[PDB]
């Protein structure tokens, strides 16, 4: 198939500087930092992530550079470029507000439906754009969307393309069959994360009986802020029959009539006098976002 004609950028560790650590994980640490670039006058926020010097670790986090490289999209994550220190570093767009997962849990009383909905639809276009580049993420979750401004997500850690069952489809689960049609699946569990404000899928319930479950035709529970209208998505993302499911076009679309009228869809009481953090009074001295950044 086609040549992938990416740009591997390759920086000096003198150009970007370490603020402090945001997460000292099992595989490394993540720090929040700034890029300067040259004599660009600009500085970038960005995220930092570093690893001993195993020969196996390193192969894993230039592979993962790799994919991240390859892609361009506003719902997708994208690398700035890589260092090559004694232990490589990978520099990547700064997301200040976390994962999607932490967010929901912290500001639950604050989210409102027009934010959920908008979320849904941001995310279906991240994942119908890895479809249109035959990437299938193999590991999409709440945990996995990245905040960038809470109106505005990524989709991450798709350096996948210890497994996931609770999100995992059934091809996946008994064959392991990974489609896009499966990640449609995983999408469904993703939009019941949100939708119950970060809850734990089948909680309680241990990972072997999984299988049976779903084979029986048991799937989440409706959350109580979801209409039939929203819950009947979800549970068209959980059919057997792959085919079946939607497709992430069809979940921009559907999601996209919800978000014009979203107390039609998703009841949340005292939605209408929420609102969360925007460009106002603060939100954010040459710093600009990588997003507007291109050489």
């Not at 967010?103 to 639809?121: A, F, M, P, T």
């Not at 990972?207 to 959350?223: C, F, H, N, T």
């Not at 921009?252 to 869809?265: G, H, L, N, T, V």
Request: proline share 6%; charged share 25%; aromatic share 8%.
């Amino acid at each position: 198939e086609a040549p992938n004609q990416a740009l591997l950028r390759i920086l000096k560790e003198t150009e970007f500087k370490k603020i402090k650590v945001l997460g000292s994980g099992a595989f490394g640490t993540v720090y929040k930092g700034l890029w300067i670039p040259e004599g660009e006058k600009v500085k970038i926020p960005v995220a930092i992530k570093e690893l001993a010097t195993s020969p196996k670790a390193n192969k894993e986090i230039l592979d993962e550079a790799y994919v991240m490289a390859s892609v361009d999209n506003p719902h997708v994550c994208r690398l700035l470029g890589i260092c090559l220190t004694s232990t490589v570093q990978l520099i990547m767009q700064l997301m200040p507000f976390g994962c999607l997962l932490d967010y929901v849990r912290e500001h639950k009383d604050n989210i409102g439906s027009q934010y959920l909905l908008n979320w849904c639809v941001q995310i279906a276009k991240g994942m119908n754009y890895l479809e249109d580049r035959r990437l299938v993420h193999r590991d999409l979750a709440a945990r996995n969307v990245l905040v960038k401004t809470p109106q505005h997500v990524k989709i991450t850690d798709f350096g996948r393309a210890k497994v996931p069952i609770k999100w995992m489809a059934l091809e996946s689960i008994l064959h392991r069959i990974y489609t896009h049609q499966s990640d449609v699946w995983s999408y469904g569990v993703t939009v019941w994360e949100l939708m119950t404000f970060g809850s734990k899928p089948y909680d309680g319930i241990p990972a072997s009986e999984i299988s049976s479950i779903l084979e029986k035709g048991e799937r989440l529970p409706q959350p109580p802020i979801c209409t039939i209208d929203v819950y009947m998505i979800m549970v068209k993302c959980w059919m057997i029959d792959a085919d079946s499911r939607p497709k992430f076009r069809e979940l921009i679309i559907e999601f996209s009539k919800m978000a014009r009228d979203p107390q039609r869809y998703l009841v949340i009481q005292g939605d209408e006098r929420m609102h969360l953090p925007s460009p106002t009074d603060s939100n954010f001295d040459d710093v600009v976002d990588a997003d507007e950044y291109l050489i």
